[PDB]
Amino acid sequence: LECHNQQSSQTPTTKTCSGETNCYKKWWSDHRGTIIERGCGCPKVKPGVNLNCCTTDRCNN
């Protein structure tokens, strides 16, 4: 499984997961706007964070 792992609006990058069967994208806003974190797995998040856990290559851009 290949998942995006770049932050926010950075040029996209991916990593090849080593066991995981989800990718994730998590996002919320601060005083500057939207922050995005991306990687392998499907983590628990703090309430009020937006989360996508998806199951296909590069699904979390």
Short mmCIF file of C-alpha atoms in Angstrom, two decimals:
data_model
loop_
_atom_site.label_atom_id
_atom_site.label_comp_id
_atom_site.label_asym_id
_atom_site.label_seq_id
_atom_site.Cartn_x
_atom_site.Cartn_y
_atom_site.Cartn_z
CA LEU A 1 0.00 0.00 0.00
CA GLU A 2 1.34 3.37 -1.07
CA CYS A 3 0.20 6.41 0.92
CA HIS A 4 0.81 10.12 0.62
CA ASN A 5 2.84 11.53 3.47
CA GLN A 6 3.51 15.21 2.63
CA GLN A 7 2.23 17.92 4.93
CA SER A 8 -0.39 20.54 4.12
CA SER A 9 0.15 22.07 0.68
CA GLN A 10 3.65 20.72 0.08
CA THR A 11 4.54 19.05 -3.16
CA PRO A 12 3.03 15.58 -2.94
CA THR A 13 5.19 12.70 -1.79
CA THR A 14 4.39 9.09 -0.96
CA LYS A 15 5.77 6.30 1.14
CA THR A 16 5.31 2.54 0.83
CA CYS A 17 3.63 1.25 3.95
CA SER A 18 5.18 -1.69 5.76
CA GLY A 19 2.16 -3.59 6.97
CA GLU A 20 -0.68 -1.04 7.04
CA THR A 21 -3.88 -1.52 5.06
CA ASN A 22 -5.13 2.09 5.38
CA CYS A 23 -3.82 5.48 4.46
CA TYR A 24 -4.91 8.53 6.42
CA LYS A 25 -5.34 12.27 5.92
CA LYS A 26 -6.06 14.38 9.01
CA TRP A 27 -6.79 18.11 8.98
CA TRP A 28 -7.95 21.06 11.07
CA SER A 29 -7.36 24.82 11.07
CA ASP A 30 -5.34 27.29 13.10
CA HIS A 31 -4.85 31.02 12.76
CA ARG A 32 -3.09 30.55 9.39
CA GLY A 33 -5.56 28.13 7.81
CA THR A 34 -5.73 24.42 7.18
CA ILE A 35 -3.06 22.00 8.46
CA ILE A 36 -2.91 18.51 6.92
CA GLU A 37 -1.06 15.42 8.07
CA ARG A 38 -0.88 12.30 5.86
CA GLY A 39 0.52 8.78 6.26
CA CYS A 40 -0.02 5.06 6.70
CA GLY A 41 -2.64 3.56 9.05
CA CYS A 42 -5.83 4.93 10.52
CA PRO A 43 -5.11 6.66 13.82
CA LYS A 44 -7.39 7.81 16.57
CA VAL A 45 -7.72 11.63 16.40
CA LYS A 46 -8.55 14.36 18.88
CA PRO A 47 -12.26 15.31 18.63
CA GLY A 48 -12.88 17.99 16.04
CA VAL A 49 -10.13 16.84 13.71
CA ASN A 50 -11.24 15.86 10.22
CA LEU A 51 -10.07 12.38 9.19
CA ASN A 52 -10.14 10.24 6.05
CA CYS A 53 -8.91 6.66 6.35
CA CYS A 54 -8.89 5.07 2.90
CA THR A 55 -7.78 1.71 1.54
CA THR A 56 -6.24 2.15 -1.91
CA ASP A 57 -2.92 3.38 -3.24
CA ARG A 58 -2.44 7.15 -3.05
CA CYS A 59 -6.00 7.60 -1.78
CA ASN A 60 -5.11 10.21 0.86
CA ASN A 61 -3.85 13.19 -1.20
#
